[PDB]
């Protein structure tokens, strides 16, 4: 039954359940804040199998909101921060929204949502102009429905990945297989309307705290440690490199710390080196699809091999990991190819499109759009997103092993490495570079450094220095922003 997932959750809950800002918030006056909230979304109206649309900032009652929306059985649709107006209102009107629910400091993006598409009801966590207050019940107990088709989750990319409640169960499994058996006291400074979202349910379930910041400042970050004594964090990449590199971190207490999580996006192997050393073993790498979840982590102690600084782990407990070539077949151990992913954790599929869906899935097994390798240990090595493969005459260049390299000399920080079309090379080898500090390496130094390492075709022609590589919405490398530049 679908409802078990947001009992698992609920029947979770230990005596503190979030810190932030304003304080403490009790799993009492956090259960009621679901019952209150379940009954409002009820009496409005909204029906178990349609979405509800949640556009909000990184708030305790946002905690509730979300166990609310997959208590009454309707899947729940994060609107990302970071977005667009036009990406976020596509995401509304595709998921089969019933509501757009919204805090009161995003009023502004709700009413700019509002003039786009149109929504049955409109809801707001308190007074507001453009919207009915839902924070306005007896001894009421929570009254749960079932989502017809069993959806938890509907998340975009631009396709709505379908998450079932079982799955978001098998994620509690994996998150105490890779974050250890609860209480957790977890920092989540990354938005609720994605994974911190699943993190706080993960972190509610296991009887723990969910520690919440608004944004990711290292600063903030430190204190929150050292004052909330927090065992887990999970950080962008980014955010793990600022936070190593910050001035105080030796100065500061972080002994509550048993996991420092990071994932996302590809690692800068000597950044992560660097992090290992400066904070102690309680570096973890997560890697993960919208479409796969969880697929594997690096533990601290994978982290003490450098070898391992490549690898984004071994798989998860129930993760089936295959590399495949273009026909479909199953390839040996060391052999580059398709990550191809089964897991109880896997999308159902492509919300409303089975056309996409079926481009994707096949037998169960999922394709994560990565390309990699595993290691005579059973450590799989990402080499590169499957678009970012740079084609010369029949030979694979991945851009992520140039990057790599260049990201070892000591005044690289950033690199990211694309191709663009030529007649005379089938395609040419482009860096973008982001250099350290104050420092001015020679280009020359790179492009030796690249042919000692990999070889002749490896080695960029243009080496442009910039002040730093953009990044998506998401917070991934934009290498579609980054080929533009050398054409
Ligand atoms: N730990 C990691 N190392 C390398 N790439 C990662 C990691 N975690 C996530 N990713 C990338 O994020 C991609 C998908 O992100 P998304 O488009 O948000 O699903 C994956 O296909 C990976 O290439
Ligand atoms: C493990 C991880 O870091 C991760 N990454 C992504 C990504 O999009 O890059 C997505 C997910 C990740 N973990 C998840 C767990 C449940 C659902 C989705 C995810």
Same mark, same amino acid.
């Given at each position: 039954?679908?409802?078990?997932?947001?009992?698992?959750?609920?029947?979770?809950?230990?005596?503190?359940?979030?810190?932030?800002?304003?304080?403490?918030?009790?799993?009492?006056?956090?259960?009621?804040?679901?019952?209150?909230?379940?009954?409002?979304?009820?009496?409005?109206?909204?029906?178990?199998?349609?979405?509800?649309?949640?556009?909000?900032?990184?708030?305790?009652?946002?905690?509730?909101?979300?166990?609310?929306?997959?208590?009454?059985?309707?899947?729940?649709?994060?609107?990302?921060?970071?977005?667009?107006?036009?990406?976020?209102?596509?995401?509304?009107?595709?998921?089969?929204?019933?509501?757009?629910?919204?805090?009161?400091?995003?009023?502004?993006?709700?009413?700019?949502?509002?003039? &786009?598409?149109?929504?049955?009801?409109?809801?707001?966590?308190?007074?507001?102009?453009?919207?009915?207050?839902?924070?306005?019940?007896?001894?009421?107990?929570?009254?749960?429905?079932?989502?017809?088709?069993?959806?938890?989750?509907?998340?975009?990319?631009?396709?709505?990945?379908?998450?079932?409640?079982?799955?978001?169960?098998?994620?509690?499994?994996?998150?105490?297989?890779?974050?250890?058996?609860?209480?957790?006291?977890?920092?989540?400074?990354?938005?609720?309307?994605?994974?911190?979202?699943?993190?706080?349910?993960?972190?509610?379930?296991?009887?723990?705290?969910?520690?919440?910041?608004?944004?990711?400042? $290292?600063?903030?970050?430190?204190?929150?440690?050292?004052?909330?004594?927090?065992?887990?964090?999970?950080?962008?990449?980014?955010?793990?490199?600022?936070?190593?590199?910050?001035?105080?971190?030796?100065?500061?207490?972080?002994?509550?710390?048993? &996991?420092?999580?990071?994932?996302?996006?590809?690692?800068?192997?000597?950044?992560?080196?660097?992090?290992?050393?400066?904070?102690?073993?309680?570096?973890?790498?997560?890697?993960?699809?919208?479409?796969?979840?969880?697929?594997?982590?690096?533990? $601290?102690?994978?982290?003490?091999?450098?070898?391992?600084?490549?690898?984004?782990?071994?798989?998860?407990?129930?993760?089936?990991?295959?590399? &495949?070539?273009?026909?479909?077949?199953?390839?040996?151990?060391?052999?580059?190819?398709?990550?191809?992913?089964?897991?109880?954790?896997?999308?159902?599929?492509?919300?409303?499109?089975?056309?996409?869906?079926?481009?994707?899935?096949?037998?169960?097994?999922?394709?994560?759009?990565?390309?990699?390798?595993?290691?005579?240990?059973?450590?799989?090595?990402?080499?590169?997103?499957?678009?970012?493969?740079?084609?010369?005459?029949?030979?694979?260049?991945?851009?992520?092993?140039?990057?790599?390299?260049?990201?070892?000399? $000591?005044?690289?920080?950033?690199?990211?490495?694309?191709?663009?079309?030529?007649?005379?090379?089938?395609?040419?080898?482009?860096?973008?570079?982001?250099?350290?500090?104050?420092?001015?390496?020679?280009?020359?130094?790179?492009?030796?450094?690249?042919?000692?390492?990999?070889?002749?075709?490896?080695?960029?022609?243009?080496?442009?220095?910039?002040?730093?590589?953009?990044?998506?919405?998401?917070?991934?490398?934009?290498?579609?922003?980054?080929?533009?530049?050398?054409?």
């Amino acid at each position: 039954p679908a409802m078990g997932y947001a009992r698992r959750v609920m029947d979770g809950i230990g005596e503190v359940a979030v810190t932030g800002a304003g304080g403490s918030v009790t799993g009492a006056r956090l259960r009621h804040q679901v019952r209150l909230l379940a009954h409002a979304l009820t009496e409005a109206g909204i029906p178990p199998g349609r979405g509800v649309a949640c556009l909000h900032a990184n708030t305790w009652r946002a905690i509730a909101l979300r166990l609310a929306v997959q208590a009454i059985g309707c899947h729940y649709v994060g609107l990302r921060p970071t977005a667009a107006v036009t990406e976020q209102a596509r995401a509304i009107a595709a998921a089969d929204s019933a509501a757009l629910v919204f805090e009161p400091s995003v009023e502004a993006r709700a009413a700019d949502l509002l003039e &786009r598409v149109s929504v049955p009801v409109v809801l707001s966590l308190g007074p507001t102009s453009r919207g009915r207050d839902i924070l306005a019940p007896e001894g009421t107990p929570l009254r749960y429905r079932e989502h017809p088709e069993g959806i938890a989750v509907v998340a975009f990319t631009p396709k709505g990945v379908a998450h079932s409640s079982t799955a978001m169960s098998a994620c509690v499994d994996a998150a105490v297989s890779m974050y250890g058996r609860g209480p957790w006291r977890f920092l989540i400074p990354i938005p609720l309307s994605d994974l911190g979202g699943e993190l706080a349910q993960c972190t509610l379930a296991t009887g723990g705290t969910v520690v919440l910041l608004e944004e990711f400042q $290292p600063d903030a970050v430190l204190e929150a440690i050292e004052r909330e004594r927090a065992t887990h964090v999970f950080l962008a990449p980014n955010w793990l490199y600022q936070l190593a590199e910050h001035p105080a971190l030796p100065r500061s207490d972080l002994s509550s710390l048993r &996991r420092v999580v990071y994932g996302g996006a590809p690692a800068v192997p000597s950044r992560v080196a660097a992090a290992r050393e400066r904070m102690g073993a309680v570096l973890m790498q997560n890697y993960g699809t919208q479409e796969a979840a969880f697929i594997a982590a690096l533990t $601290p102690d994978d982290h003490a091999r450098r070898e391992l600084l490549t690898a984004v782990g071994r798989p998860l407990p129930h993760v089936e990991v295959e590399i &495949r070539d273009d026909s479909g077949g199953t390839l040996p151990r060391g052999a580059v190819g398709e990550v191809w992913v089964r897991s109880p954790m896997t999308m159902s599929g492509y919300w409303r499109d089975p056309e996409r869906t079926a481009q994707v899935l096949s037998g169960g097994w999922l394709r994560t759009g990565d390309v990699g390798t595993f290691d005579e240990d059973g450590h799989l090595h990402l080499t590169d997103r499957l678009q970012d493969i740079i084609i010369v005459e029949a030979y694979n260049v991945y851009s992520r092993r140039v990057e790599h390299v260049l990201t070892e000399h $000591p005044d690289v920080r950033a690199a990211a490495v694309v191709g663009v079309p030529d007649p005379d090379s089938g395609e040419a080898v482009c860096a973008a570079v982001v250099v350290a500090d104050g420092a001015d390496p020679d280009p020359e130094h790179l492009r030796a450094l690249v042919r000692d390492h990999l070889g002749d075709l490896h080695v960029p022609r243009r080496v442009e220095f910039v002040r730093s590589i953009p990044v998506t919405p998401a917070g991934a490398p934009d290498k579609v922003k980054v080929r533009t530049w050398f054409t």
